[PDB]
Amino acid sequence: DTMKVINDPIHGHIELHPLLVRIIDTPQFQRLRYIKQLGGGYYVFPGASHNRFEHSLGVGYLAGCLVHALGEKQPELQISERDVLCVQIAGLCRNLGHGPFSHMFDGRFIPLARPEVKWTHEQGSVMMFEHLINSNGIKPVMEQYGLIPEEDICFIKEQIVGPLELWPYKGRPENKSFLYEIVSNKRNGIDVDKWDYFARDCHHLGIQNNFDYKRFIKFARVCEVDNELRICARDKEVGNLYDMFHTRNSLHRRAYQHKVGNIIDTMITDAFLKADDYIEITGAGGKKYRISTAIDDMEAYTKLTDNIFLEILYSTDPKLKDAREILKQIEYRNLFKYVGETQPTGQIKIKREDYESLPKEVASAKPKVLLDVKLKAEDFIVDVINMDYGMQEKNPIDHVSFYCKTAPNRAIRITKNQVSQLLPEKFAEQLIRVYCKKVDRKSLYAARQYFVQWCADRNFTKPQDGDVIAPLITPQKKEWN
Amino acid sequence: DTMKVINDPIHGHIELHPLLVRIIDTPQFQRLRYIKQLGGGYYVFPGASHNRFEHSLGVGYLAGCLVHALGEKQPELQISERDVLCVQIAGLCRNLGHGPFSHMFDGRFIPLARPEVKWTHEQGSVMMFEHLINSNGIKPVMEQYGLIPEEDICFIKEQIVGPLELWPYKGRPENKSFLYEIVSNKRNGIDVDKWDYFARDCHHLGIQNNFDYKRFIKFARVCEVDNELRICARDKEVGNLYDMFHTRNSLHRRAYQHKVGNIIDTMITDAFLKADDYIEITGAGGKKYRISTAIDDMEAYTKLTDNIFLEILYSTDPKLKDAREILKQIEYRNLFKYVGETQPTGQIKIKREDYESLPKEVASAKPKVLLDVKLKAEDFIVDVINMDYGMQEKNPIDHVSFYCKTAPNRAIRITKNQVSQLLPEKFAEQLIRVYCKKVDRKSLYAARQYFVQWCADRNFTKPQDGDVIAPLITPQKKEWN
Amino acid sequence: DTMKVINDPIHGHIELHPLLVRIIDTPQFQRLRYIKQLGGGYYVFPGASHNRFEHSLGVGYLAGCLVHALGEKQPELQISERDVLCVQIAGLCRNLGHGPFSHMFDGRFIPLARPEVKWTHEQGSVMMFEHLINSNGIKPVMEQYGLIPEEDICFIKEQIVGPLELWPYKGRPENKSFLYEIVSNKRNGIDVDKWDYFARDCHHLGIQNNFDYKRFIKFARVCEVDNELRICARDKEVGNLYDMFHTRNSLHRRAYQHKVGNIIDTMITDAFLKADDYIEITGAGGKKYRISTAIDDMEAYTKLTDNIFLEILYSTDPKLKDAREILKQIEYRNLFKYVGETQPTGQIKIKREDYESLPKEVASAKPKVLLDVKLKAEDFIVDVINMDYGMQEKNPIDHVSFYCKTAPNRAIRITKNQVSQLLPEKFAEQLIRVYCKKVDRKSLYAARQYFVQWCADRNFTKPQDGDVIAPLITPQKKEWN
Amino acid sequence: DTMKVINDPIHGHIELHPLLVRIIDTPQFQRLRYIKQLGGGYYVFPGASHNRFEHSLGVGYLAGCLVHALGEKQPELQISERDVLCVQIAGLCRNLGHGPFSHMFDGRFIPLARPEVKWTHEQGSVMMFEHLINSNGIKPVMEQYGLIPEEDICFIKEQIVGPLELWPYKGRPENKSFLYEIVSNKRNGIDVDKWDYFARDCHHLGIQNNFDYKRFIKFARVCEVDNELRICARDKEVGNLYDMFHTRNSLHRRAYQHKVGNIIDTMITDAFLKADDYIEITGAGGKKYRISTAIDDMEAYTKLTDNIFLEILYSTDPKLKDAREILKQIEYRNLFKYVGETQPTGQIKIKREDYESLPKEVASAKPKVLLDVKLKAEDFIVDVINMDYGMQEKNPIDHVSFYCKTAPNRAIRITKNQVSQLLPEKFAEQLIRVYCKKVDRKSLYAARQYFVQWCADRNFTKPQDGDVIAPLITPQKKEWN
Ligand SMILES: Nc1ncnc2c1ncn2[C@H]1C[C@H](O)[C@@H](COP(=O)(O)OP(=O)(O)OP(=O)(O)O)O1
Ligand SMILES: Nc1ncnc2c1ncn2[C@H]1C[C@H](O)[C@@H](COP(=O)(O)OP(=O)(O)OP(=O)(O)O)O1
Ligand SMILES: Nc1ncnc2c1ncn2[C@H]1C[C@H](O)[C@@H](COP(=O)(O)OP(=O)(O)OP(=O)(O)O)O1
Ligand SMILES: Nc1ncnc2c1ncn2[C@H]1C[C@H](O)[C@@H](COP(=O)(O)OP(=O)(O)OP(=O)(O)O)O1
Ligand SMILES: [Mg+2]
Ligand SMILES: [Mg+2]
Ligand SMILES: [Mg+2]
Ligand SMILES: [Mg+2]
């Protein structure tokens, strides 16, 4: 084996170490070729055909770029080839646990199918990695290239999921703390995963990326902070970091939480729920699993991809009729209809335990308007989206360390007020989207009256088109006009 | 219904007439979301996740751009909204007939599975279109927007496949001949289909596109030629057209005929052949079809997509064991091994009827070299690739008409010698690639000796690495050194 | 004359009407080829070689695109070819009044050379346009293409500079009010001038543009607002518009107000001041003007371009020695040294009449630190930069009208709270940069102590590197640590 | 001093070693900011505002990239930091000798102004470099960073201009021969200068670049050839190299030799000739030089830039009236008129000594057509352009060495027949453009008849529009029809 070159449209010609090639050329990794990065987003942005596979290559490549750059600027860090490979592998492998349609699976489907369980793609990534290594005889190959499986496998997993439980990490000591900031940055979210997806998603979406990660890499240094060696950014680059998060939020607003992309994810989730009892996936020793239980056996999970969607759509089994009909409505574009969007007011905040009760509230609103049809709870979908800068109410730039050019080894902190008054005063918010499952003209007219009445009753913000869609409702509320 | 905007990364925001939206929002069209544009190319160029769906939107959009541009410059043509919609629809629908992995299906699989039949994706596109229209009640909608289904459906089909049988076309008269040059140009190959794929494939492959179709559109005019109204290009743009074909050939060399992408297509084709007797696809009236017979029923063909690959890979049926093993070798990257490439010499040309005999010739070559293993015909794959400028030996620019700025209505012809001495003297060639199905070191060493000996025996060109891979063979041939 | 095609790297092949070509092919327009768009920015961003000429073509092109798009969607507007040409000409010509190094000239040099006068590039553009028309016999040509010079010339000028004095405009009636929003939008700043420069500046700077103007054009409509017909944006696009201004501000922060680009502009301005008494420019009737007086005669102004810089640099006249020495320091990169940046606190705001007093305040600060040198007022430069969303304290989105898809003819308003909590709470701020003209190590050390002491005395924000550059000063201030 | 980062739109963030910064920040280098890369090309392609300065940075950067890549792949080469800096400096400095409007100066102006002398920009680059070093005290700084001025300055100059006189180079021994292939490749033309300009010129022109230099860098290796260590390319990349030269030729055809860009260069050259006796440039010791003699004194040459054009255009001196009038015709776009283009037939080849006689031949042609005006030799311009693959009749790929993957250290040769039949059979040709200085309708009509008659008399190829512009002339020639 010698090193391979891959041509990526985002990053150009990437060199892959033979050990990485060996990890990549497994069923567990190749699986990511059949999982769309953006799930239902492809049904709205037709350029978004890209899959988790190529994103993972890019994350692995950027992880290598950063660790290499730091080692070249600061030989005193003693970054070894072994460290580089471990960081690259963690980069490559942090998406292994994604399910069909990526975030739809762990964001919508598992929560509803297995409410008692707490599962994340991160957990899944660790499990799949363990399975990948064991199933494919990778430990010997790691040894051949100077890695120490006991320590290094632990390191890799900690990079992905954090401490598997003071310095809480075992795979590397505090002297190498900065290595944990590269692939999945638990402190402030600034990691090479974002950098690849910003660039790649934009390339495919037809939206232009505002963040320059190569510049950031050039200005990054390691400095001592509170007895840890941490990655620090040049002080004057602080604006670029606020911009990075602004970019992320804009991508969510325009693409990842697109009102129609979300309703398609919701419809697909509904079909999966209705198919769950009848689709069988063979795991370890020939034992059969369901869509919702494949997460318990990585052999089965390996075979759980976007292909599930087509298996359902092309099924003839009468058991799968209801699931198959939902997917067919997607193909004819007979989708649940968007009614509108609103936000809570003041401090008001909506908890996950209350999500299920919301369609019922909308249906209970009693607008003083003439209605041909009366709508029930089950006719309404209410999608609640938490938007933030990756840390709920917290400002992630308050968790970033900087250095100045006159003292490159001395870490400092920068407050929001030292940067600009034009920055946000809050860093988290909720959006509520309401959809109606009844798509005819009269139902939709009615749904609009309920929705706007409910906004008024709850003292939510005025929907943007409120006066046009519900002119008889909006005048009752002084604050709106 | 009103017009929709779609954001395409190649063309930007494209407007779609509601009738086009109706055609698009059918199972027959949406199917193209699950067929990779470049087939096995994705297994070499990881950016090439793109599917035929989005390419078809682009072709439909460009077809509209060109017909609109001509109408705006020359009102005297009397191009109607009806003409525009018909040309857009033909553009949208000329890829409907592609099968799993696009050109792998009609270029490799069908020729081997059903040797007696002549089938093309073009034929398939017409059949699928008819099925699309009838299955979805589109004729009434066409009438609602001013189309005349009898004439216009005929027109659309002729744009895709040519005369369904002097002026040989029935869907439009000679006065509108130029409309037939837009979507699928049978005279010289210069059409909007190429223009989309150059741009789109380059964007995804990470290769840069050298042809400017927007410029071409600006300089296009309709002029009278031999009692037909034909699209003519500005004389000075002739170099750009030679460049267009040069670009196409370069894309084939670098990407579409990549030696490994082709062997992957070949391996997938082999798996499909071994699965063909056991995979069943439900068509009209519940009747069951095979992969190779789904082309006879469009209802079944609608459900024949790349998903077949994963159906096989994830199968547990022992009948599909051999097919499934081939796909598993792809995932582990245990691929048939490339041995080398060579070309015929002089006038020598290789016909399709002789393809099957070639592995046998390679195995019959008797290199005077010491060999541990002896290889048989079935161990060798010989892939013969015809490279041309789209017209076999013919120069397509000899079939283009031009105009000069001093007389914009007067069509003229341009010879190669009026353009440049730096153009090719021939416009067609064949490449022969040889691969070995036995992948071990000793088999591959042997395969190299056979291959190079066979090249010498047949008086083919010297493989580039011939002296290195077969130093004991190459000296016998004077011409090579 | 017939229409010309120009290839622009930003917009592609642009068609120019022959009348526009005639306006372009004059000394008054061609002059823009020798004025850098970004002035001193080229000395920091080497890709920023671009000149106002090519920007002006782009603004003229986009002005045409928008007016065409509106006319195509709404024939009821009665937009004529005459209206289109007038809007294009205003677009082409709104940059005619720029001086050497663009905003350096009217932002720094004229204010200091002719403090009593109020001049702007806008005024200059009108004057230069009048001169262009009269000097080149353009009125007859305008008549030949259906324009009415009396009304249309007035219209064009009003599009550039606003009312030359209710409906305050004379060139077109209220029915055509929306035409005034295209080239230079006085109501909210959203115009095609921004759109070209975002795209063009980013292309040359090596920074990526976040705003999609083509999308905006597709969703724009004209609706009635307060008895005017105004351009309205689709409601859901409101986020994109906030993003547009965010992008503008980011471009200012990264490029247009780059600390070193600004000091170069300042040094060039200083050289121009020292050269002003000696450089002579011939205007009308052979009369001689100065750099600072060329604005009074358009014949002289025509010959006032970036070339002035080189005329000074290459001069041998001993009178110009001091000016020439400043420019030579630029070439050797011996620039005034950046000391730091800070901002006012709370409501504090700094007026233009106080700018001159600021170096004196810095020099008067008395840091308790050991200093080798003592610095004087004239050793300090204080640059005050007003950053906003184009309307001082005002939110420009409050001055935008929207429409919803259920009632496309009905204009509505959207408040900030209807959009997001993650938007700025303020829309204007000031940055203060301090530089030292003494560049040696000890002077700069001292300058840092004065600067930080002055920030502390004035209760400005703590400079980012304050603790590193002035560790003995920063502890006295509680608020900073 | 520490290393600086510059943001280039083509290459991104480039790091500059402090020694390079010191070389850059001199009047001799900064001069390149005022010399357009493409000369008169900007007057046809408005995006082509770029100057030689930024190109030189890119060449210096790519030179560094390649030498670094080779050192990283092959430590055994013993490439030192000293070698890297020398190669970077040669890259940075190979354009120092360009004059106003780049190739216009040494391609058109000097040959006509000083016919007896042989001068090239290469020679000029060496002289300017020597002047840069000596004028700015760079030798001590070189020593400070480990360079040995005696050997290294010699090396740098040899990289630029070749041997200043068996191994003919003195700055480095044969073991380092491959270092001479990087900045200016005298063996086959494949160097980093091309790579920058392809990318940069395309970015500005609005034409898309077909060559991937990063890929080439990845596949480059050093191998022994004929007792030299040379840079070798991977065998299979041979097609990419043919494509590189094809791209270069296409860029010449579309842009660098654009018929109107060339006539603008020609008109500027004419103005310079008429201004040459009156413009004075101060050189060493206050001595005065002319445009045409500034090449003899680098102090004067330092001040000779594109600014000369504006000095002439803005002059009031009656001596410069004729020169100034030519430039004014450019501004009004009253340009010499293109008549047509033709090529020699067979082996026919046109020598430089015969260029002056050609307008006289055109004027002597006696077309049997009715003419209002009779034209004289001085009314015609004949521009002869030699197009090749950089080596006259020779195929540069015959002078490239390759390696195969089975033996990466073993250099091999590849013939054209081993690559493709679709390649050119010849690698050089001449284009002849004829223009008329009399621009009225009747003169141009006449000029066309003379031109086509002269083509017929000389047995040149038929102009493309010949039948349209000269219908009464073309029938006499059988071969043409
Ligand atoms: N001319 C090209 N330009 C850009 N990318 C290319 C080109 N040819 C191939 N690629 C892409 C496809 C792959 O992603 C990557 C590696 O391809 P390539 O170098 O052909 O690998 P290979 O494995 O076929 O070569 P090798 O024969 O040495 O193993 O580069
Ligand atoms: N709701 C969604 N809809 C569509 N795509 C999504 C959604 N959520 C995430 N994605 C996609 C887009 C991104 O490229 C990618 C981000 O998720 P992932 O790659 O797991 O990193 P992450 O979990 O750290 O995300 P983040 O950057 O938000 O922290 O997944
Ligand atoms: N082959 C090409 N590909 C891309 N852009 C080009 C090409 N040739 C020219 N351009 C650019 C340069 C100009 O901005 C614009 C117009 O060029 P061109 O068509 O040659 O005008 P022209 O005035 O010389 O031709 P004509 O003889 O038609 O008047 O296009
Ligand atoms: N925010 C930015 N984003 C992208 N590129 C930038 C940005 N700021 C500057 N550049 C570019 C322009 C310059 O050519 C190059 C260096 O600029 P910059 O880092 O500001 O150096 P500088 O010398 O002004 O700062 P300092 O000397 O404090 O390090 O990078
Ligand atoms: Mg390989
Ligand atoms: Mg919609
Ligand atoms: Mg022209
Ligand atoms: Mg700096």
Residue D27 CA, chain-centre distance (Å), reads 23
The helix (H) or strand (E) run that includes residue B342 is strand B337-342
**What angle do helix axes B81-93 and B149-161 make, rounded to 10 degrees?**
50
Residue B301 CA to residue B256 CA, distance in Å, equals: 25
Does A253 sit within 8 Å of C239, measured CB to CB?
yes
Using a CB-CB cut-off of 8 Å, the residues of chain C touching A404 are: 464-465, 468-469
Q: Say if ligand 3 is within 6 A of residue D207 CB.
A: yes
CB proximity list for A333: less than 8 A, separation 6 or greater: B21, B25
Taking the CA atoms of C282, C288, C290 and C294 in sequence, report the sign of the dihedral they define.
negative
D249 within 8 A of D189, measured Cβ to Cβ: no
Resolution of the determined structure in angstroms stands at: 2.8
Task: Select from C1, C2, C5 the residue to mutate for testing ligand 3; criterion: most ligand atoms less than 8 Å from CB.
Answer: C5
Say if strands B337-342 and A402-404 run parallel, antiparallel, or are unpaired.
unpaired
Residue A341 CA, chain-centre distance (Å), reads 22
**Nearest in space to B462 (alpha carbons), one of B432, B427, B435:** B432
Residue C117 CA, chain-centre distance (Å), reads 19
Whether C236 contacts chain B with CB within 8 A:
no
Whether A348 contacts chain C with CB within 8 A:
no
Taking the CA atoms of B462, B465, B470 and B472 in sequence, report the sign of the dihedral they define.
positive
**Nearest in space to A51 (alpha carbons), one of A307, A329, A266:** A307
CB proximity list for D304: less than 8 A, separation 6 or greater: D99, D100, D281, D291, D294
CB neighbourhood size of A327 (10 A): 23
DSSP 8-state class, residue C437: S
| Both structure tokens of A211 | 């963040």
Following DSSP, what letter does each residue of A82-135 receive, concatenated? HHHHHHHHHHHHTTTT--TTTHHIIIIIHHHHSTT----HHHHHHHHHHHHHHH
At C206, is the secondary structure helix, strand, or coil?
A: coil
DSSP 8-state class, residue C393: B
| Both structure tokens of B273 | 């052949």
Say if strands A228-234 and A402-404 run parallel, antiparallel, or are unpaired.
parallel
Round to the nearest angstrom and report the end-to-end CA distance of chain A: 72
Residue A18 CA to residue C229 CA, distance in Å, equals: 66
At B412, is the secondary structure helix, strand, or coil?
A: strand
Q: Say if ligand 1 is within 6 A of residue D240 CB.
A: yes
Q: Say if ligand 1 is within 6 A of residue A5 CB.
A: yes
Domains of chain C with CATH codes: 1-334 (1.10.3210.10), 335-481 (no CATH)
> Which residue in chain B is spatially nearest to D341 when comparing CA positions?
B418
D60 within 8 A of D88, measured Cβ to Cβ: yes
A278 within 8 A of B281, measured Cβ to Cβ: no
What's the gap in Å between D227 CA and the centre of ligand 6? Answer: 70
Considering only CA atoms, which residue is closest to atom 24 of ligand 1? B260
**Nearest in space to C140 (alpha carbons), one of C132, C149, C127, C150:** C149
Please name which ligand lies nearest the alpha carbon of B253. 1
Round to the nearest angstrom and report the end-to-end CA distance of chain C: 72
Residue B118 CA, chain-centre distance (Å), reads 16
D106 within 8 A of D99, measured Cβ to Cβ: yes
**Nearest in space to B222 (alpha carbons), one of B414, B410, B415:** B410
| Both structure tokens of B393 | 């030996």
Considering only CA atoms, which residue is closest to atom 12 of ligand 1? B45
CB neighbourhood size of D39 (10 A): 27
Counting from 1 in the atom list of ligand 4, the atom nearest the Cα of A236 is 28
Considering only CA atoms, which residue is closest to atom 10 of ligand 4? D7
The CA-atom distances, in angstroms, between A172 and each of A161, A185, B27, C315, D255 are: 15, 15, 53, 65, 57
Using a CB-CB cut-off of 8 Å, the residues of chain A touching C235 are: 464-465
Residue B60 CA to residue B92 CA, distance in Å, equals: 4
| Both structure tokens of A363 | 């249906």
Report the alpha-carbon angle D467-D473-D478, nearest 5: 80
Using a CB-CB cut-off of 8 Å, the residues of chain B touching A333 are: 21, 25
CB proximity list for D445: less than 8 A, separation 6 or greater: D371
Tell me which amino acid residue D391 is. M
Dihedral, CA of residue B323, residue B328, residue B331 and residue B334, to nearest 10: -100
The helix (H) or strand (E) run that includes residue C5 is strand C4-8
Residue A72 CA to residue A223 CA, distance in Å, equals: 15
DSSP 8-state class, residue C446: H
Size of chain D in residues: 481
Residue B439 CA to residue A119 CA, distance in Å, equals: 42
Does B7 sit within 8 Å of C215, measured CB to CB?
yes
Residue C367 CA to residue D229 CA, distance in Å, equals: 63
Dihedral, CA of residue C107, residue C108, residue C110 and residue C111, to nearest 10: 90
The CA-atom distances, in angstroms, between C161 and each of C4, C153, C166, C359 are: 28, 12, 18, 35
| Both structure tokens of D435 | 């223009």
D39 within 8 A of D50, measured Cβ to Cβ: no
Using a CB-CB cut-off of 8 Å, the residues of chain D touching C10 are: 47, 206
Residue C349 CA to residue C368 CA, distance in Å, equals: 28
Say if strands B4-8 and A281-282 run parallel, antiparallel, or are unpaired.
unpaired
Considering only CA atoms, which residue is closest to atom 16 of ligand 1? A6
Using a CB-CB cut-off of 8 Å, the residues of chain A touching B204 are: 9
CB neighbourhood size of B116 (10 A): 4
The helix (H) or strand (E) run that includes residue B445 is helix B441-458
Size of chain C in residues: 481
CB neighbourhood size of C81 (10 A): 12
- What residues are paired with D224 via a beta bridge? D229, D410
- What residues are paired with D4 via a beta bridge? D16
Report the alpha-carbon angle B62-B63-B64, nearest 5: 85
A147 within 8 A of A87, measured Cβ to Cβ: no
**What angle do helix axes C259-275 and C321-331 make, rounded to 10 degrees?**
160
Residue C407 CA, chain-centre distance (Å), reads 37
The CA-atom distances, in angstroms, between C1 and each of C16, C17, D332 are: 11, 9, 14
Considering only CA atoms, which residue is closest to atom 9 of ligand 3? D254
Those of residues 406-425 in D touching chain B at CB distance below 8 A are: 406-407, 410, 412, 414, 417-418, 420-425
DSSP 8-state class, residue A398: G
Report the alpha-carbon angle B151-B155-B158, nearest 5: 140
Residue C382 CA to residue C252 CA, distance in Å, equals: 18
Show the 3-state SS of chain D. CCCEEEEECCCEEEEECHHHHHHHCCHHHHHHHHCECCHHHHHCCCCCCCEHHHHHHHHHHHHHHHHHHHHHHCHHHCCCHHHHHHHHHHHHHCCCCCCCCCHHHHHHHHHHHCCCCCCCHHHHHHHHHHHHHHHHCHHHHHHHCCCCHHHHHHHHHHHHHCCCCCCCCCCCCHHHHHHHHCCCCCCCCCCHHHHHHHHHHHHHHCCCCCCCHHHHHHHCEEEEECCEEEEEEEHHHHHHHHHHHHHHHHHHHHHHCCHHHHHHHHHHHHHHHHHCCCCCEECHHHCEECCCCHHHCHHHHCCCCCHHHHHHHCCCCHHHHHHHHHHHHHHCCCCCEEEEEECCCCCCCCCHHHHHHHHHHHHHCCCCCCCCCCCCHHHEEEEEEEEECCECECCHHHHCCEEECCEEEEEECCCHHHCCCCCECCCEEEEEEEEECCCCHHHHHHHHHHHHHHHHHHCCCCCCCHHHHCCCCHHHCHHHC
Say if strands B228-234 and B221-225 run parallel, antiparallel, or are unpaired.
antiparallel
**Nearest in space to B241 (alpha carbons), one of B401, B388, B407:** B401
Please name which ligand lies nearest the alpha carbon of B338. 1
Report the alpha-carbon angle C241-C410-C406, nearest 5: 85
Round to the nearest angstrom and report the end-to-end CA distance of chain D: 72
A209 within 8 A of A189, measured Cβ to Cβ: no
Does D310 sit within 8 Å of C307, measured CB to CB?
yes
What's the gap in Å between C470 CA and the centre of ligand 8? Answer: 20
B289 within 8 A of B124, measured Cβ to Cβ: no
**Nearest in space to C455 (alpha carbons), one of C372, C352, C382:** C382
Residue with tokens 């999308």: C215
Tally DSSP H helices, then E strands, for chain A. Answer: 19, 11
Residue A145 CA, chain-centre distance (Å), reads 33
**Is residue A463 packed enough to be buried (19+ CB in 10 Å), middle (13-18) or exposed (0-12)?**
buried
Does C205 sit within 8 Å of D203, measured CB to CB?
no
CB neighbourhood size of A285 (10 A): 7
A50 within 8 A of B54, measured Cβ to Cβ: no
DSSP 8-state class, residue A386: E
**Nearest in space to D216 (alpha carbons), one of D184, D256, D243:** D243
Residue D268 CA to residue C191 CA, distance in Å, equals: 38
Report the alpha-carbon angle A42-A45-A49, nearest 5: 45
Round to the nearest angstrom and report the end-to-end CA distance of chain B: 72
CA atoms within 13 A on the CB side of C78: 7
The alpha helices in C320-407, defined as continuous H runs, are 321-331, 358-364
Does C45 sit within 8 Å of D49, measured CB to CB?
no
Residue D78 CA to residue D176 CA, distance in Å, equals: 9
B335 within 8 A of B259, measured Cβ to Cβ: no
Torsional class of C39: left (φ above 0), alpha (ψ -120 to 50), beta (otherwise): left
At C205, is the secondary structure helix, strand, or coil?
A: helix
The CA-atom distances, in angstroms, between B84 and each of A185, A250, B129, C74, C331 are: 53, 37, 18, 20, 59
Residue A265 CA to residue A38 CA, distance in Å, equals: 10
Tally DSSP H helices, then E strands, for chain C. Answer: 19, 11
Greatest Cα pair distance in chain A: 77
B156 within 8 A of B93, measured Cβ to Cβ: yes
Q: Say if ligand 2 is within 6 A of residue A44 CB.
A: no
CB neighbourhood size of A25 (10 A): 16
B229 within 8 A of B79, measured Cβ to Cβ: no
Following DSSP, what letter does each residue of B201-258 receive, concatenated? HHHHHT------HHHHHHH-EEEEETTEEEEEEEGGGHHHHHHHHHHHHHHIIIIIT-
**Nearest in space to B245 (alpha carbons), one of B369, B113, B122, B416:** B416
